[PDB]
Ligand binder design. Structure first.
Ligand SMILES: Nc1ncnc2c1ncn2[C@@H]1O[C@H](COP(=O)(O)OP(=O)(O)OP(=O)(O)O)[C@@H](O)[C@H]1O
Ligand SMILES: Nc1ncnc2c1ncn2[C@@H]1O[C@H](COP(=O)(O)OP(=O)(O)O)[C@@H](O)[C@H]1O
Ligand SMILES: [Mg+2]
Ligand SMILES: [Mg+2]
Lengths: 464, 49, 47, 503, 50, 135, 350, 49, 119
């Protein structure tokens, strides 16, 4: 005995079941579409109970071709993804289907994507700094080994460049095992990544799960859970340390809104779903470094219309330990990676963790840039000349500090042709201390763009 | 509210209590969510009436 | 003469600032009206 | 026993419209209808069955909804939302339903293809490593477009977007005349919300240039119902995909994609779905991405075909930070922002060299152009800032002045007239003239003439330059020396509109 | 037909009544004025604009 | 069968309705098949209504002032005229409520004529160009 | 076969018809209002079908005095307006009823206001310039034949003088006729226009259609289509070039939005109807040249808060090809026709 | 409306009248209230159509 | 009102804060079944507030001196509640945060504040 479809509205499908055989929430159901070249087996996920033995489900595939009255069979379990050391090296989708080898993973151990987060008693905060080799990050927003990092920004400001750069900075040398969740990003980038990780030979040590934009919202929101399951398996069972890249996690909340509008739930503010914070929290709290093991996560967050006050970014800000924030304005200045020094933040930027020499320089730089950002309102009208000398001396080196935060990243080599640069922390501290104290105030601003370290600064200045 | 109750017990028993709420905007968001799921018509900025 | 030149430059900068601020304020006007109307209509569609 | 009793009890369909309003209808009956099935009504009107309730079916009406009324019979077509497709569409103007609107005749369709067919997955695709020549100096030099690429043409009202895309379509004729499908690009021009006169003008321009041998127009003019505007991009991509999977190369222009957003806003609000930002429904992203992800280059295991997309977006007062602009910028692989503040001065096409980017980059640029032009972008950006500075410099060093004049002459070089696409073999020379400094003695006011004349000089004599470039896609020294000799020989024969010779 | 705008800034500055003569308009215009008033007020608007 | 239903319906001289709902200044009155849009309805407590809405089931009537006195079940009688106000020269120097009733207490008003509140305006052909000052 | 009024809510009326005789949408229905002080024959335009044979309609005249259960008679056609040479020199409302002489034009041929624009094959493939014969216009801001020209200005800048001039221009240089659509116009201003065009004796070549502000939004919305229908008749059957004045199109948009709200359709952006762009297109795309004859248009266009991003002007200006702005700073110099040469612009100047 | 009705009788008899409305914004607010209480559909700024 | 009418002994009525009245009205509105108006107040706001305010009046020969404090949401003096309350008052001592931040205390805005007796 099994159920029947009785309503269809986009990817959302209502199914009626016998009186006593209603499926539990988040159970997976199978249905058939038999029109033609469009035919396929649909997986539906139970999202609600509507009463009278009727339940409302989210389709993981496009419903096109689904006719009313077709039978629907309950699997009795949630959507299950393959887990195991054999997962590494291959590409998967949200439903556990391998794309590189269709039959792969059918015989592996299967874990449910829906799981409760770790007990509070097993949580412990991390403080060990992670050295990436980017000046602005390592100085003002030091990442945490085993913490949660995020890259915010609008459209067309450097999510992908900086994300693959950080892949080169961490994953290229990380001794552990990596997972890459592509949540609603463009597919061409996924193919580029699948090729690049093989060129660099890193592929054999990382797993990829993709849910790109073309897919309907129902799976577009579950892809994150699908990959997080493999990440937390590598965490809890194998005991390895893990890197969990996710791009872009805003599309998870966007798919949540799309499915919400169909489920019939009333809209919140500007038009997101209610429980937005609850879904995002249920997702993010699972990505945590429990005692004795670690899962380092770098997330990308989209920001529509550059409205940093949009409820979704404003919500996701709460779950992150490090938050690099890109900006349109800094990008227009030609600065790259275009990080906003005053908006970005990191919780471990305190003297007890990073040391006094680092903290003092970071805070002096922040003070200089803040005074600059306050004088901008006059700078824009009357130019620098109107300012008093205590302000003009400050602005002259503020511009230089700002431009020196730029760096010639390895990823940009494919566009600019200039090779990449990695700098150690101590050299960055020395350089910015010298800058704030004025040992380089005599050089022109254009000398500072996209340098790298200090020796490269001298080499470039000599040529001008 | 449970924090306030644990506080009020000591308070009325003659003790001195300090309560930190971190943070009430999240409570407003949760109340918004609950009220919208119960399908109460929201007021300004989608917050409950 | 340099005062002339610099004050002309400042006038032009202020003109462009007025333009950008007016554009941003009109976008804010439209967004505010749209949000108010969406709130009213969500209240109506709730009943 | 119970089973047999149940079977005993259990032992061409036509529906009826119960409700109709403003481009949407509700239909009774049709128990066996598929979701998004193309229903048909008595008036010769079609519909898309979006919502299937327990008692009635919601159908968006395509075309003249005026002809629908309560009590009309509705019948199945038996086809999921689909359009006819084939090679026969080449040279025809069709509405989103695949029906001919030009009155030129019937369509000898090959087959039918559904619109909701999913894009090719990560494993099926290939790198964008193949040049889609546009013929615009300001684009092929700094922002090259590869086959399988999505290049946004975002800009302001009356800034030459449609003109640029028509030039891009016209430039492909030099290739069409070769029979090999690997070069033989074919095109589709999807017109959404454009004026009928503008579509007629595009039709005429393409006919005069010979582009209609290989171009298909899908017309959703402003007069028609929102549903046509909503479908036009999807039916255009459906026409393209059939060629694409067969191993052809396709070029899709969407002019303009913001009005599909507006049409879907209308449709959604008529269905009473709760709107989001800018009154748009929450799923406009799944509209534009569902459309643009279809564009790809396929792996040779699937046919080496590709489809290139050039979506146009209209920006309110150059506010590139708006909702739909940022949504499409987040989907496409680059943008060529056409600034109006430059268009009115005469910089045409008004490509903003600072904001424009090609996120594929020089991978799809031929080696000749890659060497000659690859420096131009940053040089022009620094020239623009140098000009912004020197506009009020009472005096400045000679080096700044020389860089300023070089920049001004490069800017004057980049512009070109409408419907005048230049082959790459000529574009490389046109940019060589500037980047290598041979223009350093010609007055600005004549530069645009000078180049346009020299390309004809090299066209009548010393053709081995263009031929050597074309046949190897790199500019060899044995040809560069003859090029420089021809340039210096021509400089003596050329003369300005006023003043002295050009040395 | 015609709009007379009263603005508080002018009210405080001393212009009372606070008619913003530079933005208030009447589409009827001089047809409503007697000839003695046209002989005089004609230049008033230009003078106040200058 | 239709004949018996019609006999019973007609057996129900001028019609009288009943308030089915009331709140916040509005009242829904069932019945009154022949009511017209914006007719003055008079309730038993002396209060008046306008009948601004006419649904299938019941009239929606906005209530002028003395709302408290309305209750479910009250008989609603109809006046045979759309909103009308008295007019005349006797209004000069008086303060009146929107219904033309004296509110200054100086005494009654010697009404001279009555005019509907929603009469047609003078059309394009009836008017003349403005050429006279309002000093 | 006749229907019954079952619900009345403001200008909106619901009518129930026998099962089989439900009218087609946009059909015109006639009803009676019998109260003496408000006696009328009410015109209703079918907007939607609600089921149970109920039909949602918007009234072209005030509903006051309307009684439930009153008979409604379907006409079997859309709102129809009279077309012919005799239409020249007279003032009409949107419903095609004359205001200057009640009962005039009943015998004339009537055309449906809701008719489709020209087919794709009939459109002219290129924009031809209109040599109106005014120096500033021809030189600085050339007009397009069959295009749209936005007009800015007000009182004291020579607007109505320009209108009379363009009427004379079309009537004497091209042998055409003018049509004036007073969309949401002041009644006083309409009488002023009527008397001015009569004094100049250009009225004999101008057809006036006034949709007044005094009347509900449906009429303010359909007046433009009525005027454009008369212009279409003059274009196709009489073979004359026509010049159509629309004052003001922003009130066409506003009336559309208001009717949309009364019908209960959810508002879009800053508050216009969802069908804004299509509803404006179904008018503007109809103003075009075909088969050698053209309907040129001058459109006065208001801009709320003088921002050109508001969906109303943003939609209007996508369709129009020229812009003429009249300036008081030019008029005061004695420069007539006061066209500002720098603010005005045109897209055919190429 | 009743002020205008009182004025119109003088107007049609050949008198000259002056009508001051102080102020129509509260007329609009009152009509908005009446309409919203009748469950008529709102539009921009919560005013009816 | 008892002190006013039945005794005639002049009286001072203080109210703090009279915005919470219409606030509670707005809180109960959506539950009663009223459709929300502008930024989110009950539609009856103007008349619900007037039925109260008109009672505080001082009829001839028997005075009431009323002093009522009004909250301004989001410092938005445009909000319908203050905008409606402004009409019922002879004197308004409009405080503003901009003045308070300058340390000026009692922080009255000299420009916005107004009185009818200043003739
Ligand atoms: N190559 C060019 N050089 C100079 N001017 C041009 C060029 N191309 C187009 N124009 C100008 O722009 C006009 C056509 O522009 P086009 O139609 O491409 O604008 P658009 O971006 O399509 O605007 P819309 O989308 O509103 O039609 C021409 O009439 C001409 O004035
Ligand atoms: N250092 C740099 N130099 C030059 N270009 C850069 C640099 N960093 C980033 N970019 C450009 O920015 C673009 C980033 O796009 P992306 O981050 O993918 O946007 P989104 O994620 O919003 O789609 C790239 O195409 C790249 O060309
Ligand atoms: Mg990216
Ligand atoms: Mg165009």
């Amino acid at each position: 005995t099994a159920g029947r479809v009785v309503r269809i509205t986009g990817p959302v499908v209502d199914v009626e079941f016998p009186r006593g055989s209603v499926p539990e929430l988040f159970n997976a159901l199978h249905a058939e579409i038999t029109f033609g070249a469009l035919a396929k087996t649909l997986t539906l996920e139970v999202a609600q109970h509507l009463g009278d033995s009727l339940v409302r489900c989210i389709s993981m595939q496009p419903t096109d071709g689904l006719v009313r009255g077709v039978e629907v069979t309950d699997t009795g379990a949630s959507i299950s993804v393959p887990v195991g050391d054999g997962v590494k090296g291959h590409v998967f989708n949200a439903l556990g289907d391998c794309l590189d080898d269709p039959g792969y993973g059918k015989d592996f151990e299967h874990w449910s994507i829906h799981r409760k987060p770790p007990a509070f008693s097993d949580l412990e905060p991390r403080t060990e700094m992670l050295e990436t080799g980017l000046k602005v990050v390592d100085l003002l927003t030091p990442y945490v080994r085993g913490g949660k990092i995020a890259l915010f920004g609008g459209a067309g400001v450097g999510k992908t460049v900086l994300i693959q750069e950080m892949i080169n900075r961490i994953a290229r040398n990380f001794g552990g095992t990596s997972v890459f969740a592509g949540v609603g990003e463009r597919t061409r980038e996924g193919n580029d990544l699948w090729v690049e990780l093989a060129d660099a030979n890193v592929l054999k040590d990382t797993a990829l799960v993709f849910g790109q934009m073309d897919e309907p919202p129902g799976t577009r929101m579950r892809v994150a859970l699908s990959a997080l399951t493999m990440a937390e398996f590598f965490r809890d069972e194998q005991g390895q340390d893990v890197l969990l890249f996710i791009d872009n996690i805003f599309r998870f909340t966007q798919a949540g809104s799309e499915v919400s509008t169909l489920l019939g739930r009333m809209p919140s503010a500007v038009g997101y779903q209610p429980t937005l914070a609850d879904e995002m929290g249920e997702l993010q709290e699972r990505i945590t470094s429990t005692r004795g093991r670690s899962i380092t996560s770098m997330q990308a967050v989209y920001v529509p219309a550059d409205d940093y006050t949009d409820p979704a970014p404003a919500t996701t800000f709460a779950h992150l330990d490090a938050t690099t924030e890109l900006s349109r304005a800094v990008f227009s200045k030609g600065i790259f990676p275009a990080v906003d020094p005053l908006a970005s933040s990191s919780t471990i930027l305190d003297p007890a963790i990073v040391g006094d020499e680092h903290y003092r320089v970071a805070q002096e730089v922040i003070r200089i840039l803040q005074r600059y950002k306050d004088l901008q309102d006059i700078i824009a009208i009357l130019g620098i000349d109107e300012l008093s000398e205590e302000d003009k001396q400050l602005v002259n080196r503020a511009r230089r500090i700002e431009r020196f935060l730029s760096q010639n990243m390895m990823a940009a080599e494919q566009f600019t042709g200039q090779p990449g640069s990695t700098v150690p922390l101590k050299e960055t501290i020395e350089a910015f201390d010298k800058l704030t104290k004025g040992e380089f105030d005599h050089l022109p601003e254009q000398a500072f763009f996209l340098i790298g370290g200090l020796d490269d600064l001298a080499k470039k200045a000599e040529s001008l | 509210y449970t924090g306030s109750a644990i506080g009020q017990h000591w308070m009325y028993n003659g003790k001195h209590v300090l309560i930190v709420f971190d943070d009430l905007s999240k409570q407003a968001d949760a109340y918004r969510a609950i009220s919208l799921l119960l399908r109460r018509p929201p007021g300004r900025e989608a917050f409950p009436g | 003469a340099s005062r002339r030149r610099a004050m002309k430059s400042a006038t032009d900068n202020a003109d462009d600032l007025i333009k950008a601020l007016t554009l941003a304020a009109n976008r804010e006007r439209q967004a505010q009206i749209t949000q108010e109307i969406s709130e009213i209509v969500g209240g109506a569609n709730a009943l | 026993x119970x089973x047999x009793x149940x079977x005993x009890x259990x032992x061409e369909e036509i529906g009826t419209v119960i409700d109709a309003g403003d481009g949407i209808a509700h239909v009774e009956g049709l128990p066996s209808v598929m979701t998004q099935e193309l229903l048909e009504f008595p008036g010769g009107v079609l519909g898309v069955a979006l919502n299937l309730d327990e008692h009635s079916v919601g159908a968006v009406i395509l075309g003249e909804f005026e002809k629908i009324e309560e009590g009309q019979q509705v019948k199945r077509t038996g086809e999921v939302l689909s359009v006819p497709v084939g090679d026969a569409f080449l040279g025809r103007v069709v509405n989103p339903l695949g029906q001919p609107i030009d009155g030129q005749g019937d369509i000898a369709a090959e087959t039918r293809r559904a619109l909701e067919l999913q894009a090719p997955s990560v494993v099926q695709r290939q790198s964008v490593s193949e040049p889609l020549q546009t013929g615009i100096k300001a684009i092929d030099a700094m922002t090259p477009i590869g086959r399988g690429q999505r290049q946004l043409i975002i800009g302001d009202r009356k800034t030459g977007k449609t003109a640029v895309c028509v030039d891009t379509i016209l430039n492909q004729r030099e290739a069409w005349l070769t029979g090999d499908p690997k070069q033989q690009v074919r095109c589709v021009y999807v017109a959404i919300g454009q004026k009928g006169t503008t579509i007629a003008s595009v039709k005429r321009a393409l006919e005069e240039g010979g582009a209609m041998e290989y171009t298909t127009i899908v017309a959703a003019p402003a007069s028609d119902a929102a549903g046509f505007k909503w479908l036009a991009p999807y039916t255009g991509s459906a026409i393209g995909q059939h060629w694409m999977y067969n191993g052809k190369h396709v070029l899709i222009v969407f002019d303009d994609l913001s009005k599909q957003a507006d049409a879907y806003r209308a449709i959604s609000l008529l269905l009473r779905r709760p709107p989001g930002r800018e009154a748009f429904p929450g799923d406009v992203f799944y509209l534009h991405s569902r459309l643009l992800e279809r564009c790809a280059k396929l792996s040779d295991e699937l046919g080496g075909g590709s489809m290139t997309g050039l979506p146009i977006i209209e920006t309110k007062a150059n506010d590139i930070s708006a909702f739909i602009p940022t949504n499409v910028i987040s989907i496409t692989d680059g943008q060529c922002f056409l600034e109006s503040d430059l268009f009115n001065q005469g910089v045409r096409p008004a490509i903003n060299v600072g904001v424009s980017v090609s996120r594929v980059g020089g991978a799809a640029q031929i080696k000749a152009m890659k060497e000659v032009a690859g420096s131009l972008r940053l040089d022009l950006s620094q020239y623009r800032e140098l000009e912004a500075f020197a506009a009020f410099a009472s005096d400045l060093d000679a080096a700044s002045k020389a860089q300023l004049d070089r920049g001004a002459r490069l800017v004057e070089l980049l512009k070109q007239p409408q419907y005048s696409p230049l082959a790459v073999e000529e574009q490389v020379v046109a940019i060589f003239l500037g980047t290598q400094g041979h223009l350093d003695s010609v007055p600005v006011e004549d530069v645009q003439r000078f180049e346009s004349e020299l390309l004809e000089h090299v066209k009548a004599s010393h053709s081995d330059i263009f031929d050597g470039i074309r046949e190897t896609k790199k500019l060899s020294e044995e040809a560069e020396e003859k090029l420089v000799s021809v340039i210096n020989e021509f400089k003596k024969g050329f003369q300005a509109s006023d003043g002295s010779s050009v040395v | 037909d015609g709009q007379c705008f009263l603005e508080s800034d002018l009210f405080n500055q001393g212009v009372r009544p606070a008619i913003n003569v530079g933005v208030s308009v009447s589409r009827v215009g001089g047809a409503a004025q007697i000839k003695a008033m046209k002989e005089v007020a004609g230049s008033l608007r230009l003078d106040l604009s200058q | 069968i239709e004949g018996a239903i019609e006999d019973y319906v007609s057996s129900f001289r001028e019609e009288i309705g009943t308030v089915i709902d009331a709140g916040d200044g509005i009242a829904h009155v069932e019945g009154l098949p022949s009511v017209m849009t914006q007719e003055l309805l008079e309730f038993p407590g002396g209060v008046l209504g306008v009948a601004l809405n006419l649904d299938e089931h019941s009239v929606g009537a906005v209530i002028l002032g003395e709302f408290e006195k309305i209750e479910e079940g009250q008989q609603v009688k109809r006046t045979g005229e759309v909103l009308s106000v008295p007019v005349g020269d006797a209004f000069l120097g008086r303060v009146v409520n929107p219904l033309g009733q004296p509110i200054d207490g100086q005494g009654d008003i010697a009404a001279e004529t009555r005019r509907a509140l929603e009469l047609q305006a003078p059309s394009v052909v009836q008017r003349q160009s403005v050429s006279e000052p309002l000093q």
